[PDB]
Structure formats: C-alpha cells, structure tokens
Amino acid sequence: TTPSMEDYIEQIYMLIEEKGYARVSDIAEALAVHPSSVTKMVQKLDKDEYLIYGLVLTSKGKKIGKRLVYRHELLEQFLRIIGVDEEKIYNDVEGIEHHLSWNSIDRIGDLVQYFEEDDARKKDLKSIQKK
C-alpha cells in the first residue's frame, strides 16, 4: 500500500460516500489526472483486492478508505486548532497525510482531544502566538 494507492482509495471512498458510486471519470477529475492513470491504479487496486472492477470496494478497501478519510479530517482539525490559516490547511494535509505513522496519527489524535476538551488550553495557546 503506497501513498498513491492510499490517495486513490481515500478518493474512491469519498466519492462513494458523496454520490453512492465511484466513476473513473469522477476519480480522474477529482484527482485532476488522466483517466488512463486512473484505469491503471484501479486495476492495481483490484489485483490487491481493495475493490472490484460499477466500482465497488471490498471490505478491505472500506476499512482503509474509512481510516484514510478519518486521518485527513483529524489532520485538518489539528492544523485548524493550532491556528493555521484555513486556506493553507488542505494542501498541507494532502502532502503529509500519507507520510505519518499510526503512532503519530494517534498522538495527534490525543493532541486534538487535549485542546477540544478544555477551551482554556486553546486560549493559552493563542496567547503564545501573540507573544
């Protein structure tokens, strides 16, 4: 499971969740790539049993897509919470998401929980940004 395959599964999962199905055309446009590039990855994903090529994810692909979508959202929340400009959050998440261990993700999970459970901590963090 390379970062590119992950990106595709993340995208396919999202499309299925949003529209109810994933068309190579929708994937190609969503990733801003050529449909051939997409056709090649889909076949690779099929071979690896993440999906069945009417694009359907196997239980294996759903678990992964779900984890990948969860990781993306958590990473945006993380950067949002620490005060990163909203417009820059998405691009940063896209480039780092597929390069972090689960250990890092889980610890970032606890960090987000840390600030979300007590707003006083968010206020203190903001203070430091001013100093």
Add this chain to the structure above:
Amino acid sequence: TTPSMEDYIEQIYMLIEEKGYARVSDIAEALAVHPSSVTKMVQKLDKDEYLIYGLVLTSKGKKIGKRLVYRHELLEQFLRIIGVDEEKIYNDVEGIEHHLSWNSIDRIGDLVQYFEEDDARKKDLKSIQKK
C-alpha cells in the same frame, strides 16, 4: 523551491556543518543515491545559485539550508513532545518536512513553545494518552 532540491540542500548544509565540507560521495551515501544522480542535482543547484562546484553554498543556499535544519529539528521536537515513539520520529519528519507551509511550521513552533513553558501541560496531555 523543489522538495527534492530542498532535501539535497538540507543534506549539503548538514555535511558542511559536521565535516566542514560536503563531498559528492558523502552526499550520495547520505541520500542513498547514485553519485551520478547527485552530480546532476548539484549542477541544477549551481545553475539556480544555491552553491558553486569542494562545493560551496552561496548566501542563498546557506539561508535555506539553515532554515531546513531548523524545521527538521522542530518537527522532531514536536513529535517527541506529543509522545511519538522515538524510533518512529525521524522517518515521519523526513517524509512531512518538505510538505508543510511556513504557516504550519510556525504554528507548530508556538505549540512546542506552549508545552515548554509549563510541564503540567505535558502531564495533562500524557494523561489523555492513558484515557
């Protein structure tokens, strides 16, 4: 400019700081790449005025290199402060360091400063890791 050029500059900068000079052989071995690849990059770097081909960094290459080493250091401190297993930290930094805007880097800098001025915060976060 480029995530790869950035990786070389960071490496060249480190070698100059450690040894006082940077050898193609030391670069090729540090990046785990063939000396030919390196030779091609250094020439690209020279054209762009980051250095002069032993090889010397120009004021532009030094400033960049210094920043990159700072970012690497901070990211490792970041992940360490939040509890990531040490063995996992280096590889995570290496893969996300060249994909974060300065905005994110600076906000992480404040986050690190936040946990540094009060151990109670570190302990509180550590608790959540138990929950």
